Homo-oligomer: 153 residues x 3
C-alpha cells in the first residue's frame, strides 16, 4: 500500500505540473488586450463608458469592485489601460457622506492618492466621484458624467 500511494503521488505531481504550465500560457492570452496584472490584483476594462452608479453595479455583479489603486505601482498599471483606451476612468472612492473626505466603498479612508495639482476642487459644488486621467493623475468629477468602466478582481 506504500507502493500504491507512491504511484498515486507521482501521477498527481505530473497532473499538477501540466495544469500549471497550460494555465501560465492562458493567463497571458486572457489579459490581452483589456487586462493588467499587478501583484495579486487584476484590472479589467469593459471597453465602454458609463455613469458612476451603473459602473459600480457592473463591477459588483461581476464579483469585483471599481478600480481602487492602493499604491503607486497599482496606479501605474491602471494608467497603462487608461492610456491604451485613451479614455479617463472612474475609481471606486467617493466623498458623498462627508464633503472632502474620500473613502473606499467599505468606508475606510484612503491609503494612497495621486491628485492633480489643486484637486479635489469640488468644481460647481457637486463633484463627489473620482476619475483617473491618461497621465495617471486623479480629479474629483460629477458622478453623473460618463467615464471608462474598469473593474478590479
Amino acid at each position: 500500500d506504500v507502493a500504491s500511494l507512491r504511484q498515486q503521488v507521482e501521477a498527481l505531481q505530473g497532473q499538477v505540473q501540466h495544469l500549471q504550465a497550460a494555465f501560465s500560457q492562458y493567463k497571458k492570452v486572457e489579459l490581452f488586450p483589456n487586462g493588467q496584472s499587478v501583484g495579486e490584483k487584476i484590472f479589467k476594462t469593459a471597453g465602454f463608458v458609463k455613469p458612476f452608479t451603473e459602473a459600480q453595479l457592473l463591477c459588483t455583479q461581476a464579483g469585483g469592485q471599481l478600480a481602487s489603486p492602493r499604491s503607486a505601482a497599482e496606479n501605474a498599471a491602471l494608467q497603462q489601460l487608461v492610456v491604451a483606451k485613451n479614455e479617463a476612468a472612474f475609481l471606486s472612492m467617493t466623498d458623498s457622506k462627508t464633503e472632502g473626505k474620500f473613502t473606499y466603498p467599505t468606508g475606510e479612508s484612503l491609503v494612497y492618492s495621486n491628485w492633480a495639482p489643486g484637486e479635489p476642487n469640488d468644481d460647481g459644488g457637486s463633484e463627489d466621484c473620482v476619475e483617473i486621467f491618461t497621465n495617471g493623475k486623479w480629479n474629483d468629477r460629477a458622478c453623473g458624467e460618463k467615464r471608462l468602466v474598469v473593474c478590479e478582481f
Copy 2:
C-alpha cells in the same frame, strides 16, 4: 513514507495556490461578456448573425447556442441581452415537427418563457427562437440576424 508526507504536504500548497489563481482568472474572463450559472457558462460574441451561422460558430467553439433549461438560467442569459441591448437566438427549433420545439439533440423542452400569444409561426415560417430584453421568448424566422450567445 516520511518522504511521501513531505511530497503530499507540498502538493496541498501547490493545489491550493493553483485553485485560487484559477478562480480569480475565471471571474476576470466573464467580465463583461459572460455569465456563470451552476455548471453552465454563457458568453456572447458581441455581434449579430443569422441562425445557421450563429449555430456553426458555437459548435466550432465546442459549445452550442444558449439553451436555458430553468428560470435561473433564463435570468442569467437575460443579463447579457440587456447589457448589449440586442435580442439573442436560442438553440431550439421546430423545423422537424411544426409546433414542437426541441434542443439540438432532439429532446423536447423542459422549460419555456413564451411571451403572450407566442409561439405563433408568423407567416407560416418562424422556426427559430429569440429572447428579448425582458427575458420573454418569441418564435422568429431563422434568416433574421440576432445576438450570438453560446453556452459551454
Copy 3:
C-alpha cells in the same frame, strides 16, 4: 500514518479532477470568439486595427509577439480569425535594410511563406511590413497603414 496519507491523497485527487474539468471548459470560453489554438501556439486578435509599430508594442507588452505562422497548419488557423473579422492582419516580419530582404524580428531568413501571386512587390517603394489577407495569402504593405492586431502566445 498510512491511513493519514490515504485521506490526504484522496482529497487531492478530488481537487485535481475538478480543476481538470474546470480548466478544459474555461479554455473553450476564453478562445470564443477571438482566439485559435494550433499545436502549442495560440493566436488571439485584439479585435481592432493599428499601424505596425503600435501593433508590435501591444503584443510585446502583453508577453507575446505579432503573429508569425511557421507552417500551413498555423497559417490556416490564423486565416480563420482574419476571415471572421473580415480584416487583413499584420504579421511579425519586416524588410531588413541590413539584410536586403524580409526577415523575422530576430533577423533570420523566412522559411514557410504563403505569398500571393505577384508579391512581395514593394508597391510605391515603401512596403516594409507584411499582412495576411482573408484568403490566407501574404502581401507586403506599408507599415503606417492600419491593419488587424493579432498576437501569438
